[PDB]
Design a protein around this ligand. Structure first.
Ligand SMILES: CC(C)c1ccc(COc2ccc(CC(=O)NCCN)cc2Cl)cc1
Ligand SMILES: CC(C)c1ccc(COc2ccc(CC(=O)NCCN)cc2Cl)cc1
Lengths: 358, 358
């Protein structure tokens, strides 16, 4: 009966963002897991507590819903699971071993957090409505919550994958962007053909500004890149196919990979008919995009995770451009993490009722 | 000695946004200027007072600067100039005539508002610094102030131009977008050749979704469209020329004009080398873009004026895409105006000092 105490304790700490460079170190090759165990024993509780403190700051009509209470219980359990190691000592190759076991079990426990929370949004929409202010708070909270989760899963995956070499856990220090683009395209095409029995082709072009014909590589988490590209290819294919089911030409999806001094950008262009500017804004909203998925908003979080971004801009009547912005340098790739503050406390005080424009 | 009273009086009123449809009516052909005079006698004071009330809400260290006090005096004078007609009666073709005179004189009086206010920003940067919160408030205030001005100038131009026919004042009910694109390009090219003795060519392509090969036309204020396109062509040319002064190929600027069910979009693509994502954000800031111009931020206001927008997205190492979003239908083209409220009052209460992210 001491979860609230712990949450209060660790919530007093600020999570420590790691750089892609630091990740390579922690994963080195021989950088013992002792260092990782001692670091994670403190860091995970800090991150868990921080987002838990914020969850408890939600309105009671949101808090008492079955969904929020359910995941709030997974977090509580996960927190206690890790506490068990604070007064334990490395050196014992059994302490470390059961810690890894502990992490995998925590990971599984949280496997369905996204859909579970999505169920809370649907419930709220029918129980209280879909006004702009509700959309803003949901958007504010879910971006932080999901981003926080993405980072906890990163730490955990890094530890379990390494303490089980060219790849350093989920990080590829020599990630060939175009290869990941093709992979995601191929998967999307497979699905596209099963459902539409037709699919647009792919054209890839890259611009290595400083080194003209040298293949573009970067230090990154390939699965994160795959997730984003896969989501974008799915929308681009669907839009292209549906907007041309009475035409016979099916234009290709053109992708450009540009490497600049600090940006490594990936544009995916389609001639899927485009979308009116006003609906674009709703495509990234968890609420407005829930019924009766969250691919875009969540993909954007993965991009923001390492100081990148993901933006959309179409031309109604023509097509849409989707761009993924990543940091080209490993030195600029540092975790973007949310933190509990009075700054964040005041972001849920929206008392809207008549704007500043007419 | 009753300006403060008037400001207080008319600031209690909300400015009335007109639609492109209503503008055509007020300008009809025979829609007497009496209707325009009686409407403008009330509307101009309302708009003037609203922005004046907000100006007086600025910090004293900003208010007392010579620049802000100077334009604040032009507004005061302009307000009193119009008051003179409240208790006057139409029917007298002299009352109306001196009203038109009154408007032109007001227009001239305010001709240098932009640079004058820009001088206030430079002063503030050196007198107090360029912190993010100062940038945010300047950005907040100038967008509203300038947009308010753009709308007052619209009303005035409509009245003076008409009450001096295919054009209805500054509005062309049959504006051929591509023709305006070429015009702006031609002017930019002229300047570009004088300074660089080299300039990229132009390629225009349009997509009329519902009517394939029919020229794209719209009801709009062509000079507003010209201003935006001219600003964008200048940046695209400069970037293209400078990023290739050691190459001999000079790629063209490609412009697409797409007409959708509700959007009429204009994309201007250049291979000017692009800009890193982090600097893009600063390109629209009045403060960060002041030294020791305001083309982009102000052009964006002209687009927002009739419910449109103007966005930028480049690929560092390659080029930049600039898109102007306009409403395709005259029914959706309604003035976007700022209003004085407690909603706007609370937007200047920023007390930043430690954010919500770490
Ligand atoms: C299930 C999850 C994703 C979920 C679903 C729904 C929500 C809704 O959250 C809201 C809604 C309205 C307000 C304004 C207000 O009136 N605040 C004062 C309340 N006392 C604040 C919040 Cl935090 C959050 C999270
Ligand atoms: C010349 C024009 C364009 C100009 C130049 C400069 C500015 C700067 O305006 C600021 C700066 C800081 C703050 C926060 C604050 O501390 N507020 C409390 C102040 N009592 C509020 C405002 Cl409105 C506005 C307009």
């Amino acid at each position: 009966g001491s979860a609230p105490k712990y949450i209060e304790h660790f919530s007093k700490f600020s999570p420590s963002p790691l750089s892609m460079k630091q990740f390579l170190d922690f994963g080195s090759s021989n950088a013992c897991e002792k260092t990782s165990f001692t670091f994670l024993r403190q860091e995970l509780p800090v991150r868990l507590a921080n987002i838990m403190k914020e969850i408890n700051l939600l309105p009671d009509r949101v808090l008492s819903t079955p969904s929020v209470q359910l995941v709030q219980s997974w977090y509580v359990q996960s927190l206690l699971d890790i506490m068990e190691f604070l007064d334990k000592d490395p050196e014992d190759h059994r302490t470390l071993s059961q810690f890894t076991d502990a992490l995998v079990t925590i990971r599984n426990r949280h496997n369905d957090v996204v859909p579970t929370m999505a169920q809370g949004v649907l419930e709220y929409k029918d129980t209280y409505g879909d006004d702009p202010v509700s959309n803003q708070n949901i958007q504010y909270f879910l971006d932080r919550f999901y981003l926080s989760r993405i980072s906890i899963r990163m730490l955990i995956n890094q530890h379990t994958l390494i303490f089980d070499p060219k790849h350093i856990g989920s990080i590829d220090p020599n990630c060939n962007v175009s290869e990941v683009v093709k992979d995601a395209y191929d998967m999307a095409k497979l699905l596209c053909d099963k459902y539409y029995m037709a699919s647009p082709d792919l054209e890839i072009q890259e611009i290595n500004a400083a080194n003209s014909k040298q293949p573009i590589h970067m230090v990154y988490v390939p699965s994160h890149l795959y997730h984003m590209l896969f989501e974008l290819f799915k929308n681009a294919m669907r839009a292209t196919v549906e907007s041309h089911e009475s035409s016979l030409i099916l234009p290709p999806i053109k992708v450009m990979v540009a490497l600049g001094e600090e940006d490594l950008s990936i544009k995916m262009s389609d001639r899927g008919g485009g979308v009116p500017l006003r609906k674009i804004e709703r495509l990234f909203s968890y609420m407005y995009s829930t019924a009766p998925g969250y691919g875009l908003p969540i993909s954007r979080l993965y991009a923001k995770y390492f100081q990148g971004d993901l933006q959309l801009f179409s031309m109604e009547g023509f097509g849409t451009d989707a761009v993924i912005y990543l940091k080209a340098l490993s030195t600029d790739s540092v975790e973007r993490l949310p933190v509990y503050n009075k700054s964040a406390w005041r972001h849920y005080q929206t008392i809207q009722e008549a704007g500043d424009w007419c």
